[PDB]
Design a protein around this ligand. Sequence first.
Ligand SMILES: Nc1ccn([C@@H]2O[C@H](COP(=O)(O)OP(=O)(O)OP(=O)(O)O)[C@@H](O)[C@H]2O)c(=O)n1
Ligand SMILES: Nc1ccn([C@@H]2O[C@H](COP(=O)(O)OP(=O)(O)OP(=O)(O)O)[C@@H](O)[C@H]2O)c(=O)n1
Ligand SMILES: [Zn+2]
Ligand SMILES: [Zn+2]
Lengths: 153, 153, 310, 310, 310, 310
Amino acid sequence: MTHDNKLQVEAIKRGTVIDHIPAQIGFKLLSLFKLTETDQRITIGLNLPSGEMGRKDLIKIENTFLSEDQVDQLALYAPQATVNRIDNYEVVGKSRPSLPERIDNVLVCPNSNCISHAEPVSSSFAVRKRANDIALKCKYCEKEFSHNVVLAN
Amino acid sequence: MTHDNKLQVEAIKRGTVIDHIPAQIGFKLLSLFKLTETDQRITIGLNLPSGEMGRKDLIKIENTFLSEDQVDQLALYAPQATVNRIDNYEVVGKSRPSLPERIDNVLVCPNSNCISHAEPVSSSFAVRKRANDIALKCKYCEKEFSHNVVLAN
Amino acid sequence: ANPLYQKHIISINDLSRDDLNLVLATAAKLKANPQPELLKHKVIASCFFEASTRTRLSFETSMHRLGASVVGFSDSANTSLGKKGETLADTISVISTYVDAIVMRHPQEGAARLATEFSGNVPVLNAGDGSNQHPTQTLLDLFTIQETQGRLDNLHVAMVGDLKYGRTVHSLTQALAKFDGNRFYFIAPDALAMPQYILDMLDEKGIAWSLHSSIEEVMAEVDILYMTRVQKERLDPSEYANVKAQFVLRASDLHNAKANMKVLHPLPRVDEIATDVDKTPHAWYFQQAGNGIFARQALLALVLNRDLVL
Amino acid sequence: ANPLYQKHIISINDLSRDDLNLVLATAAKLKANPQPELLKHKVIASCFFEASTRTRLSFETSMHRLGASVVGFSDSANTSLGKKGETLADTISVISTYVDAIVMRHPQEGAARLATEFSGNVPVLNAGDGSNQHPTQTLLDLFTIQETQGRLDNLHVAMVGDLKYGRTVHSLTQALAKFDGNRFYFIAPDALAMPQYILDMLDEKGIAWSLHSSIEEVMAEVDILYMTRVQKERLDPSEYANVKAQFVLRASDLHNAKANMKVLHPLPRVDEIATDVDKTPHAWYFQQAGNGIFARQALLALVLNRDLVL
Amino acid sequence: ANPLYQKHIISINDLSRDDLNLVLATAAKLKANPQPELLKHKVIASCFFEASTRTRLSFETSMHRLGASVVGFSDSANTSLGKKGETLADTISVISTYVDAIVMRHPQEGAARLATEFSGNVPVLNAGDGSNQHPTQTLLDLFTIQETQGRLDNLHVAMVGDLKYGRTVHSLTQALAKFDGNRFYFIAPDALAMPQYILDMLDEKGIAWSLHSSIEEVMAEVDILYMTRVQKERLDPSEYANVKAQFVLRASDLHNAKANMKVLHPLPRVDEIATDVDKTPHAWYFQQAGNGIFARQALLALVLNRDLVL
Amino acid sequence: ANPLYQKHIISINDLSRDDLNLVLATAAKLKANPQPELLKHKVIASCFFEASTRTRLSFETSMHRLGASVVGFSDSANTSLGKKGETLADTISVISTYVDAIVMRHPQEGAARLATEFSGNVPVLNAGDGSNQHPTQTLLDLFTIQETQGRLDNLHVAMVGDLKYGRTVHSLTQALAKFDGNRFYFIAPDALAMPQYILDMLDEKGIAWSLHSSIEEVMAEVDILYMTRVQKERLDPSEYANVKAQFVLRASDLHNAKANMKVLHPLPRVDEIATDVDKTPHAWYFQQAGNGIFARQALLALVLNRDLVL
Ligand SMILES: Nc1ccn([C@@H]2O[C@H](COP(=O)(O)OP(=O)(O)OP(=O)(O)O)[C@@H](O)[C@H]2O)c(=O)n1
Ligand SMILES: Nc1ccn([C@@H]2O[C@H](COP(=O)(O)OP(=O)(O)OP(=O)(O)O)[C@@H](O)[C@H]2O)c(=O)n1
Ligand SMILES: [Zn+2]
Ligand SMILES: [Zn+2]
């Protein structure tokens, strides 16, 4: 009950709870994946105590079942985040992010001569874990970069 | 520690609560005023079922007291809001935004020949003429525009 | 022989309603059954003394879809004529000595008409003379109104943008006034207003027009919404951006547009029509550009052919 | 319908071995019996937003040897598109409204691929996009290896020159790795070395390569010697001249070349292959350029034709 | 020290009536009793990122008649700084370690104000920034109005030409509205009239103004006639040539003018003022450019000298 | 006379450690006690055949703070001399009859040394010659290193950026290798590393150097961090954007730096040094450009004055 954790818990009835968002990625995830562009209840907690995994963030989105592909997207940012669907007051599926086939939209080509910068195009990168890193190849310029070069920019 | 619930979430030990944020301005405010770069616990309720607006947004920032001038930068986006200041589970302060004389950093001069676009200076606009509808003058190019025009882009 | 046989298409003010309909009925047939060898062995000159790629590539492609050969230049990148001091009268008296029609764009107004005094009877088709005329852009716009609306009369046409300097809005207003019962709505910033001589002509013909300052005052009633680009050179940086830059169509403004309403724009559109408008069924600016092929094919066919069997 | 029917030829990494052989077998037939009216009535756009004369004149000549009409521009000499602020998406949505295929060169990488999202189903053939791809130069090089060597596998291919920035050596290495048992010898100055991603791909496919610093270490074994130009901009004046400028072939170095050995060079060659090499039977750079005609003719034929009877 | 001692001179808005009077009082003493070794050992930088020969030369001759040294440049399509990637802030930050004062003219508005935040305690003086401010022009106009009329209050001032975009006429009206009783007549083509902001300001202070249509309409009451040049580009050639029987000044029009009426023009005067006006008593544009020397000497002397007894 | 009295200042190679110390000793006296009429009546020519605004302005402000006169030019795509057919030797031969000293920057290497053979006994000072020498930059760097660190020996100096082609970093290493005990850390992209000649020299003297991969690797031991700009053109955009998590400097990276560690940059600094470094105590690039004045005053004073007591 109290060894504080919860306090009068925002237990939602139906929704997705993204938990273990590893501190500071919490806000990225909202902006990047445009999760507040809805009319349903969100409750966000940032820099929560989670003594057991340091500090973390947590988004709870009501009556929304963000999934499969949508979940895999977050792999680049919050690689250990557990999504939990809820249909009637408890966990009815807890899903981990797997690195996807492609990352669309969100991401920018490092290549300043890549045509994707001046044009009405959605970025797209082919994802490939060259065990050590993840290389990302641009759809357009077909140049390949360390996921760290892309995620800085 | 007091019985939260989420429809109107409860009590932080000391900090600021910006309540009666229009709706869809809450995340705009988190983005713009970089309220997120704290290690403090932030709790945010989005699209919530209450005070008359109907739905409204709410941000609770424990252990930070922002005020006087900070509360006033909130006036162009959330003028209806109240900024509660809390010490020891009690609202020792209840403030509202009022139009400031200067709005720094947050706006973008709509005049494309303005020098402010390219350079390591912050935007700054002199503000004037309360609620019949606000004109903002660039510090640099000295062109006066309509707030809805700068606020569009 | 058809009325346009061997005529110079210099100005819209020279073409009658009947002339306009004959071109538009021919465009509709060539769109329906091609005639790819009709102008076989004809050689046509495409002289663009001022560069205009969009227009040149349409004119030449439609010359190529009827079997004609093309010779010519795009200049405004110093390709040698005008050097020494060759008058345009002399350039055109030498080029008409070996081509069967001249298509021509030039920076000064009146240049195509003068070409006409020196070409013998090689037809001159005007593809733009300064801020004066552009017949072939009005012919394709008209064709696109006709083909999507089924008529050229009883239309509610809104013209939005820089109405003062857009040479195409001026001409399409003169052409539509050849027809009956059309109603005009002009939506322009104050500095880019539709000139008096247009307005005065509309009044003298008993045609209805009105000025509005928001597209949503008129959306509901409108059939053709013809948007123009404001050139920011015509205003200052701050003017352009200040209040005046709301001659911009977004998809949301089309909420209550009639099911038949079409958005037309001669192009380049830079930002007055937002990208999300393209997915709407009302976006017809690119299909309008495709129609420049049949209106330009029809004019070449009618001008170089005595009798056209269709 | 053949596999390439109505495909976009954007990158070599998209064409399979089978795709590569189908093009090369068609090139061999068109070289053997012409088909000068196969693309009759087709109109093709040759948009070279970046000028490249060599490539443009081959592409258009091979369009002309199959009976197609050509419209288009060579720019990099301000011919009007890009003015006002016309995005490439919009230029290509208007040009695909009247041509049957777009051939296109552009300075930025990725531009042909984007054209593909806006062309409807008018095929886009890439003739160069920045430092990314050039499929039609690799198709003609391959055709010239095949035709002189009789095979595309079991080859000993040496690549000499600037291997770091030559976009054609990178692509021909990717294409030849589609085939079996080829061996690569790379001879480059240290600053112009063949990138890791190429080398890593070769390793992962089990293909043999080695670095040498003199052509005469390898002359004896070599079948195709593919030379590139060092751009002195890529080095400084003194670097270029210092030791590093010995990636230059003279006739004397060919002393012991196999009788079948061929010297290939995309061109311009300025001085890396000396003039006296031209009289040797091994000089094949110009015959290679002649073969660009049949490889480009074959791609246009396969892309615009359902069924090709040969 | 004096009120302006090492203060930045960026906008006329920023200088009170008393500061304007101090400048004009000093300029009259420097005109009377020269002090050629007053800024001896100071180095001023003349950074004209935008070229203006007459403004640059008036300024450097001011610097030199007070004995200062000059380093600087004018960048018409040339000369390194700013470049691209080189910020204005870093140019200033570097040049304000070399010099004692910076006079600069730049094409984007507010460039002089941005400079102020990087020059340390080196003063910067604005010689023009886009369409915003040009304070040293206004100072010399007022010196010319004070020296000819004897006062700066209770004047009947006529302003003519492009009132919409003459930067000098926007400034002169602010400035003259800090003194009392002035009456303003604004004669413009309505495509080119006073912004409503100058006008809205003028009414909050209670100043009298009227808009007229031709100078002939106010000739008789007027003390200063300030002509501005009409910008050919912001007008169509055909409206430019159409405006009434024009708004240009000829000596015939002056036959009515008050004996102390003066024609001022910031220059150049292509055709709005004919050659015959040049020889009337009322012509004062060239004496107005000579007073530029005395106005800018005064500003430099006050900025760089603490106390100045003359 | 002093050792440098009317001696040519062409290469740092040509100046001993003692001469470098004499210059830096003088510059500290001229910085302390100005002598503004020291070169009174001398005329220096500022012949910038290659434009460099910051170098030209630092030099002319040096000439003027010592009272000299300046005649000269900057030839970016303009101004007659050299022309074609007009030799550099004949330009010098003619200008060395007019002036007392020649400061010149030219694009081909050795131009300053060729000048020396034609200037008679007029001294010439090199302000840059192609990729060879720029001695007055090195003199101001060493003055900035001596004034901040207190000595020029036993320093841990880190050099970063394009070490292959920064002319300033080749010079600074020669120069610093005339003093004792200096340790060098060279952090470059391996496409852009120190030439083996700088390195071979350094080992013949016994100087210690190491090559590192990121500044984070040496931050803690370092006294001078000398950043150089990375030349976009000599790199592919895609390798330029790929290098690690970069080699740019941010204040976060400085959290480890020694209290007396200083960041120097010859400037411009497009993006290798962020804006936040500008406000740390370690930022010293703008003070480094102000010391340019004192270094070049010292060289001019010593060259043109026989004996100088200050
Ligand atoms: N009625 C419910 C039930 C669960 N949850 C949320 O869903 C998440 C699911 O975690 P759970 O399986 O209930 O136990 P945990 O150990 O927290 O799961 P994990 O292994 O991810 O830590 C919790 O954060 C909880 O807040 C909720 O909001 N409402
Ligand atoms: N320790 C506390 C006490 C109050 N609150 C917040 O403070 C806000 C408003 O304060 P309060 O004056 O106590 O309630 P109201 O009277 O409704 O304030 P108002 O009328 O201005 O909305 C509430 O949203 C509540 O969440 C809080 O989070 N923590
Ligand atoms: Zn890319
Ligand atoms: Zn501004």
